[PDB]
Amino acid sequence: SKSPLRVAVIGGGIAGTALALGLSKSSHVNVKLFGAGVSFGVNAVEAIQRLGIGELYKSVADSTPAPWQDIWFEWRHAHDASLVGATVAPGIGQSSIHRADFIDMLEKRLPAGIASLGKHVVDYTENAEGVTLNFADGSTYTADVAIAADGIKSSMRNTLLRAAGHDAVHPQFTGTSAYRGLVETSALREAYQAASLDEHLLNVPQMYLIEDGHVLTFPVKKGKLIIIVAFVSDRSVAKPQWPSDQPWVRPATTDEMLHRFAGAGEAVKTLLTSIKSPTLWALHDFDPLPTYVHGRVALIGDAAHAMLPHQGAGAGQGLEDAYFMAELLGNPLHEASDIPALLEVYDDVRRGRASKVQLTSREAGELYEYRTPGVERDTAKLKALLESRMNWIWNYDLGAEARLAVKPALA
Numbered sequence: 436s437k438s439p440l441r442v443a444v445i446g447g448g449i450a451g452t453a454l455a456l457g458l459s460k461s462s463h464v465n466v467k468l469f470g471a472g473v474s475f476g477v478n479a480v481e482a483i484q485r486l487g488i489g490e491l492y493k494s495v496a497d498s499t500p501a502p503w504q505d506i507w508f509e510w511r512h513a514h515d516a517s518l519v520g521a522t523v524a525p526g527i528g529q530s531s532i533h534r535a536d537f538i539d540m541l542e543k544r545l546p547a548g549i550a551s552l553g554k555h556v557v558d559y560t561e562n563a564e565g566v567t568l569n570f571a572d573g574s575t576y577t578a579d580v581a582i583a584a585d586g587i588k589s590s591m592r593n594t595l596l597r598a599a600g601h602d603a604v605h606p607q608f609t610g611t612s613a614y615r616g617l618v619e620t621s622a623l624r625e626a627y628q629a630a631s632l633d634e635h636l637l638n639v640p641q642m643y644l645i646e647d648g649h650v651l652t653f654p655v656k657k658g659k660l661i662i663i664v665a666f667v668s669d670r671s672v673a674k675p676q677w678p679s680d681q682p683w684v685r686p687a688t689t690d691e692m693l694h695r696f697a698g699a700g701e702a703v704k705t706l707l708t709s710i711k712s713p714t715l716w717a718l719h720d721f722d723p724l725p726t727y728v729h730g731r732v733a734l735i736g737d738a739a740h741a742m743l744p745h746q747g748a749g750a751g752q753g754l755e756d757a758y759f760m761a762e763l764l765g766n767p768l769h770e771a772s773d774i775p776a777l778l779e780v781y782d783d784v785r786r787g788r789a790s791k792v793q794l795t796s797r798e799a800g801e802l803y804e805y806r807t808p809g810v811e812r813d814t815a816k817l818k819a820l821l822e823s824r825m826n827w828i829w830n831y832d833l834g835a836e837a838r839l840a841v842k843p844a845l846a
């Protein structure tokens with residue numbers, strides 16, 4: 436060991452917090468760490484299981500009461516609530532957790548010494564022997580390797596991209612906004628009963644499709660609350676804008692929603708009407724980056740590949756980043772002078788998949804809203820694409836990917 440590997444992780448937010456937990460174990464590594472609700476698919480599982488939290492997650496996270504627990508979503512048309520199809524993810528189904536609670540349960544299993552609160556980074560500089568963080572603090576830290584997990588607005592992203600000779604990249608408003616509510620299930624069963632509606636729609640997660648919008652629901656608190664997220668999209672401007680400075684969240688009225696879902700049937704309308712105080716969220720992402728790495732620094736999580744939530748996939752990609760990165764650093768063979776090269780390996784393994792996840796989250800946005808060329812609102816073709824489209828994401832083998840986390844070959 437003599438000199439262990441010095442690794443800084445910037446951003447205390449799931450990807451970061453989990454890469455630190457990832458690295459913790461290694462002992463020959465020295466590591467320090469500088470929607471108000473989330474979803475996890477089948478491919479997150481292997482990652483969570485790994486980082487030693489299956490057990491705990493599996494208890495704290497919401498799930499759809501049995502036996503409906505394996506259903507990801509039932510897909511329906513908004514206008515009459517009729518069925519288009521269903522995506523089943525056996526085992527996981529609709530799995531979700533309050534963000535606060537997830538992060539927290541990571542960082543509270545994190546052997547003391549690693550968390551390093553006050554500091555956020557404005558800048559960094561590097562030699563080839565050193566990468567040095569500039570805290571606002573006015574102070575500094577220096578390491579062999581720095582992994583930026585500082586989210587969609589990442590400072591570090593654009594230091595890196597400018598260093599690597601690429602244009603900077605900022606959050607782009609997607610044109611889509613989300614009204615979100617949380618509703619007492621009993622209250623809605625009453626309403627549903629009152630209007631002769633199928634009460635199945637409240638027990639199993641649903642997505643209702645309409646032109647330029649969609650509404651999803653899923654039960655939480657073992658069935659007693661319903662999460663409702665009503666998505667609306669304007670595709671008039673070819674590149675839409677959010678007010679120079681509003682925050683990305685604000686409150687909104689129950690009629691500002693209903694106005695956008697005028698074409699929907701009474702199932703959807705009842706759901707929309709049950710939300711008394713809807714918040715609205717402006718959804719941002721960015722185009723895939725030309726690289727995630729330069730020198731001794733690498734981007735993970737939303738800082739690398741922020742995305743629309745339409746495939747419930749963003750966190751999971753952060754977790755796959757984290758897992759692979761833990762395995763890559765933290766492999767006793769690997770040392771300071773390997774870092775530039777090993778990071779460019781991370782890039783080769785991960786950039787493609789995550790970029791393609793970003794893009795297919797935009798594509799899902801359009802599919803759910805009757806905009807996919809070749810498909811639009813056609814029931815049979817919608818069915819076929821919905822029922823297969825998550826596979827390449829879900830059915831990925833993290834184990835095998837880990838085997839690629841190794842110094843090159845030269846041979």
Ligand SMILES: O=C(O)c1ccccc1O
Binds near residue numbers: 651
């Ligand atoms: O839980 C969510 O907010 C979500 C949003 C879009 C698509 C799938 C999802 O689980």
